[PDB]
Scaffold this active site. Structure first.
Site, PDB file in Angstrom:
ATOM      1  N   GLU D 208      29.551  59.181   3.970  1.00 34.32           N
ATOM      2  CA  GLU D 208      30.229  58.748   2.755  1.00 34.32           C
ATOM      3  C   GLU D 208      29.205  58.416   1.675  1.00 34.32           C
ATOM      4  O   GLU D 208      27.995  58.525   1.900  1.00 34.32           O
ATOM      5  CB  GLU D 208      31.150  57.545   3.044  1.00 34.32           C
ATOM      6  CG  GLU D 208      30.568  56.484   3.984  1.00 34.32           C
ATOM      7  CD  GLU D 208      31.643  55.630   4.684  1.00 34.32           C
ATOM      8  OE1 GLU D 208      32.498  56.206   5.402  1.00 34.32           O
ATOM      9  OE2 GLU D 208      31.630  54.383   4.529  1.00 34.32           O
ATOM     10  N   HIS D 246      32.875  48.977   2.237  1.00 31.97           N
ATOM     11  CA  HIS D 246      31.602  48.568   2.833  1.00 31.97           C
ATOM     12  C   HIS D 246      30.606  48.271   1.711  1.00 31.97           C
ATOM     13  O   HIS D 246      30.787  48.725   0.579  1.00 31.97           O
ATOM     14  CB  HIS D 246      31.033  49.683   3.715  1.00 31.97           C
ATOM     15  CG  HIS D 246      31.814  49.930   4.966  1.00 31.97           C
ATOM     16  ND1 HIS D 246      31.588  51.023   5.776  1.00 31.97           N
ATOM     17  CD2 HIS D 246      32.801  49.217   5.559  1.00 31.97           C
ATOM     18  CE1 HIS D 246      32.402  50.972   6.816  1.00 31.97           C
ATOM     19  NE2 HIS D 246      33.148  49.886   6.707  1.00 31.97           N
TER      20      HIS D 246
END
Ligand SMILES: CC(C)(COP(=O)(O)OP(=O)(O)OC[C@H]1O[C@@H](n2cnc3c(N)ncnc32)[C@H](O)[C@@H]1OP(=O)(O)O)[C@@H](O)C(=O)NCCC(=O)NCCS
Ligand SMILES: CC(C)(COP(=O)(O)OP(=O)(O)OC[C@H]1O[C@@H](n2cnc3c(N)ncnc32)[C@H](O)[C@@H]1OP(=O)(O)O)[C@@H](O)C(=O)NCCC(=O)NCCS
Lengths: 287, 388, 388, 287
Positions: D208, D246
């Site tokens: 990602e 995150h």
């Protein structure tokens, strides 16, 4: 020989200080390849006819030196040693005396982790008779030879160094590992070297009361050293309690006595001598 | 350098570590007046000296009246307590620690030092409190437990618990212990200590951990960055001579003997003593000049060695150095005359023109022999004393 | 979490690091009265907001009269400053920092962060002060210098000097710099910071180093052990919704779009948005349920997503979780009815009895479609909005 | 398969907690060899029909386990991980989320130095379909197979795991390396494993936005991986600025963009897919 030789290129940290200066001259006159030194704030100048740099990295890049000798006061060694380790230096000889034990505790782990070898602190230095001299040992009492010397003591080394030169045995390389509680290198480190070194035919191991480095060397010698070893432990008359000169000098816990070490060395197959004057004789024997 | 018990407890306090309530007193009035500030007796009076075994020596007592406190203080302050850890001459008592009595249920041992072998700071814990740990090690080893602080991470809690569980602790005592471990471990690192010894680490009838007695050893080499520990040094606790030898960059230590040894280099010093007592002889001391051996250093060195009167002959052994053997021989001469040395001196010069130097000592006149060689210089110093 | 410039300078102060003399004011009276406490002008007024580029936006000015200070404070306090680093909606100005003007000779850059690549805390220094470092990196790299703190030894002085010499500093400025390096490096470690940015680190006409402006970023994860940084959090500085989504264990972030996405899992969330805007569609937001997706979480999640009005359709994508798909479908239903959702919802259940769950959504009645598969659910949410 | 298997014996730290309990049961029911757990203060008791110990060392000595899974709250992980490292454990799977970055910075150095492998923190766990399951991934969507999976994301892994099970490809082993800034293991660590693993015929790499782990994996793949790799990067629609779930999720410095990683992977010879739904197809292709 071990550790150094005619090719070893050396830089001096604390080069423009009293001791860094005085001894760098001595190393220079002995023909040691001093390629420069480091003293924060004096980079760009030249000293003893050599470039002075501000950082170790600048010096390494500028001279390709691989060994550094330190003459920096205790309050700053951790910073010098760690800088040298980080600048790529692979051999550090710290002459300095007085480094906090907790400092050397951390540095010792670093040195190991980084694959960097260090002789000292609190040592006279290392010398390969005829080729290279890094430290403060008297160059005039040495002589290229076949005997390797390792010593927890400074001056004592000299007695042995003279004796071997006097019996025309000569020295392969002299290494003072030092007194301090946690040193860069111990006996087992230097021993494993002398063993693998062709030029070294016999070894002289000088220790003293305190700790158990010698006891540990003893077990190593017995299981791994093949060349003959003559050993001497000082401080038989030393009393329990006070530290004899060095901090590691105290004989505590009813352990680390001189006699304790003697026995262990003896049981390991090491030619021990009770009087530091018979080190030459002992060699004459085994050789 | 060592710290007094009260000084250690102070530090402990500063770090949130339990210690009996008490005060360090310098006069009998202070001592007795402290009894009330503490609470109801009985109280514990303890002489403050760096050596141990104060208990056996009667330097520690439990009293139950201001009259006793007063008496006790009155009896020791000024006197010198002699224990099995003090030289036969003991150490001055300049403070009497007065604290509250503790309801001891069990005595444990907690301590830490820098293990030369594993090159780490190691904490030891045992259920053998109130006993010479040295002994516990000898007899019952499996009762001692250790852990090493990771230079990379610092003292971790799981380590304090490991010790706590080994000691068989449980319940709050485990957490309590873990705290003291974390506390001590921090003092050890932050204050650059060379040793800590909580003997005994007490579990009270009330069920809490408390440091009934502590001994702290600091690392001399780190004192430059330990301003507080620097100021706690109590000069009166160690042999005076050693102290001056120090500011005079000398390194003294006395023994019985009759022959005084003056060598440059701690190694060579012990080696010299060893060789002297090998040819009969009796090493009266250990004096490491320090190498920078100048004339003044030599004159001071002679004073300290001869400040003692059991000395019948002095053996000088200078190998190498920063001064040429001839200049060193002069310092030996000038010192022998000035300090009016009244003993046969046997020098052993080595290095630069040790030749000329050796001569300067023969033509001087002074009863200064100039031996040729280590082995020799021995026999001769041994000889010059035989009879006296 | 970010700290205001004044808060950072406070910390800097606390660690003996040079910063202009000034005060944070919350009212025009305070602002102007601070001018005298400071000394003679001119003075510097700076709006306190977490974003940067305040200068370009006119949120920073140099004045020479209490009248101006007053005017400036009066104009911003309550208003919202919008810079190139703030969303087009800007951030509230609740404090005006008023400090002394600095005689700038040269502007340098000092900063630190945790390099994900080298896995160390890295300090960067450059002679390119007052400039977007991001830019300096792009154009002139060789002008940026770095060092990494050794987890084993801590920040060492030779490192501060290395940077100082690279910057061409010399004389006292080298020692001065080394100090600031050691200081910052310590704050970074002790306070668990994620980033430090002294832009610019000023060399004054008087010849001293001073931090003209600082930006500190703390590590949220460490706040439990950072009580002080914990209390400095200024809620008013970040989007409100995100804040509540938080106490409600949700994870909000808005975008333009028209289609609302509600996924469990940050990865799946971005993946869902990606796949939606792949089949045409326009991701109106990023909402990571959190997995513990209970009915309440789903009802709250719907509120936050629909607190916005650009939302024309909501796409729910729940893969796995702690609740069985049927119970999850109920929460979707109960929430759609309660929050009175007024938009076409396209769910995509997965895991335990996603079968029964998918059904519960068909028989519910509510305009709740129940797509079969990721790819599908996309096209359908994209479809349900096409036209509005 | 890599990391674990039917023989792997596991102990659980934080075993008597909600999550340690719940998932230990799940691992138990999957047939994972759970030999016991650790919870300071509860040593001596038994839980889920297994011995509970006070220290990891006691457990290791008592069960010979080699892998430990951690379900200890963030405020205490550094202490759990360091304890496990010191107790001899060679494989640590930290499920925990929320560990201070500076904590993991130190632990990461320790792990490396001690030759201990760690998956996590902030990960679903690791699973070898049919043999061993350590973590919180759905055991019912897996199937023993030939495809290896590595993912910076938790849930996304599942999408891929389902797809490969649906195309009857099966999974060799599933590894979630995690999101956190400094993880125990990165892509290159797990990749080098899948490469040397016979049972693994193809690899699925899920990354990602943020950082450059993928960009680095790309260079590794191109120079060292031979088996076919299908790659997917999420967060193409993610905007610069805020962290997406995150902390490592933010796309800063005009770097770590989804497209940046895609290209690099593509240039490395990796079969990229723009829609997470076509991971199965991509495999069908290369296989
Ligand atoms: C190391 C020792 C010799 C230094 O003594 P010294 O040379 O008189 O000290 P000086 O102050 O004269 O010189 C120290 C120099 O260190 C330098 N220095 C300080 N920090 C430094 C650093 N981090 N890196 C490099 N140089 C540094 C300075 O340049 C200083 O000299 P300068 O500023 O005048 O140019 C002394 O502390 C010592 O340890 N002596 C005992 C050694 C010993 O007995 N060893 C046992 C062998 S048996
Ligand atoms: C790790 C986590 C699951 C813990 O949650 P939890 O089980 O509800 O926490 P609990 O308090 O119930 O249990 C923790 C247990 O740790 C134990 N514990 C504390 N310190 C310990 C230590 N050093 N060693 C061992 N056990 C310890 C205690 O036993 C406690 O349970 P108990 O005292 O009731 O027996 C939670 O903090 C977390 O990180 N969740 C996010 C995980 C995640 O999302 N991962 C991403 C995967 S995609």
């Amino acid at each position: 020989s071990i550790l150094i030789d005619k090719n070893t290129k050396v830089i001096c940290q604390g080069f423009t200080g009293s001791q860094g200066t005085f001894h760098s001259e001595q190393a220079i006159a002995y023909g040691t390849k001093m390629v420069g030194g480091v003293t924060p704030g004096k980079g760009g100048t030249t000293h003893l006819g050599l470039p002075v740099f501000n950082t170790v990295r600048e010096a390494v890049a500028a001279t390709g030196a691989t060994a550094s000798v330190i003459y920096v006061p205790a309050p700053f060694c951790k910073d010098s040693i760690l800088e040298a380790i980080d600048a790529g230096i692979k051999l550090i000889i710290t002459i300095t005396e007085g480094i906090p034990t907790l400092d050397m505790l951390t540095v010792k782990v670093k040195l190991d982790e980084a694959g960097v070898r260090m002789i000292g602190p609190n040592v006279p230095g290392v010398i390969t008779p005829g080729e290279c001299k890094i430290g403060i040992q008297p160059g005039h009492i040495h002589k290229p030879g076949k005997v390797g010397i390792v010593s927890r003591s400074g001056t004592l080394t000299y007695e042995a160094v003279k004796q071997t030169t006097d019996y025309g045995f000569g020295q392969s390389t002299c290494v003072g590992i030092g007194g301090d509680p946690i040193p860069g290198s111990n006996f087992i480190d230097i021993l494993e070297m002398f063993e693998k070194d062709p030029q070294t035919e016999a070894i002289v191991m000088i220790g003293e009361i305190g700790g158990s480095a010698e006891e540990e060397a003893a077990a190593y010698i017995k299981e791994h050293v093949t060349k003959p070893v003559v050993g001497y432990i000082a401080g038989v008359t030393a009393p329990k309690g006070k530290r004899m000169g060095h901090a590691g000098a105290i004989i505590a816990g009813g352990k680390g006595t001189a006699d304790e070490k003697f026995a262990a060395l003896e049981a390991a197959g090491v030619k021990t001598v009770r009087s530091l004057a018979d080190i030459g004789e002992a060699l004459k024997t085994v050789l | 350098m060592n710290l007094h018990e009260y000084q250690a407890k102070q530090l402990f306090a500063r770090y949130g570590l339990p210690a009996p309530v008490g005060y360090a007193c310098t006069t009998p009035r202070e001592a007795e007046e402290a009894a009330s500030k503490i609470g109801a007796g009985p109280w514990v009076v303890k002489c403050q000296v760096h050596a141990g075994g104060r208990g056996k020596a009667g330097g520690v007592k439990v009293v139950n009246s201001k009259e006793d406190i007063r008496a006790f203080a009155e009896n020791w302050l000024g006197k010198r307590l002699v224990t099995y850890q003090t030289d036969a001459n003991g150490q001055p008592v300049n403070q009497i620690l007065v604290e509250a009595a503790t309801d001891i249920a069990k005595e444990l041992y907690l301590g830490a030092v820098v293990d030369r072998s594993s090159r780490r700071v190691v904490f030891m814990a045992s259920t053998e409190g109130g006993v010479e740990i040295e002994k516990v090690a000898e007899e019952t080893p499996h009762l001692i437990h250790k852990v090493a602080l990771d230079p990379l991470t610092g003292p971790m809690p799981y380590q304090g618990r490991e010790l706590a569980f080994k000691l068989g602790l449980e319940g709050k005592l485990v957490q309590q212990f873990t705290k003291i471990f974390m506390g001590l471990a921090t003092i050890f690192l932050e204050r650059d200590l060379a040793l800590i010894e909580i003997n005994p680490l007490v579990i009270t009838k009330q069920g809490d951990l408390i440091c009934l007695d502590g001994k702290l050893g600091a690392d001399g080499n780190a004192l430059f960055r330990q301003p507080d520990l620097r100021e706690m040094r109590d000069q009166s606790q160690e042999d005076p001579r050693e102290a001056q030898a120090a500011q005079w960059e000398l390194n003294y230590v006395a023994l019985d003997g009759n022959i005084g040894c003056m060598v440059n280099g701690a190694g060579l010093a012990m080696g010299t003593m060893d060789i002297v007592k090998l040819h009969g002889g009796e090493p009266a001391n250990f004096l490491d000049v320090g190498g920078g051996a100048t004339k003044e250093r030599v004159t001071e060195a002679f004073k300290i060695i001869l400040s003692d009167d059991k000395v019948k002959a002095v053996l000088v052994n200078i190998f190498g150095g920063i001064v040429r053997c001839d200049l060193i021989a002069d310092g030996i001469i000038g010192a022998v005359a000035e300090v009016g040395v009244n003993v046969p001196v046997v020098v052993r010069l080595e290095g630069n023109n040790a030749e000329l130097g050796a001569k300067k000592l023969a033509d001087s006149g002074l009863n200064i022999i100039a031996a040729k060689g280590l082995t020799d210089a021995a026999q001769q110093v041994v000889a010059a004393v035989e009879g006296k």
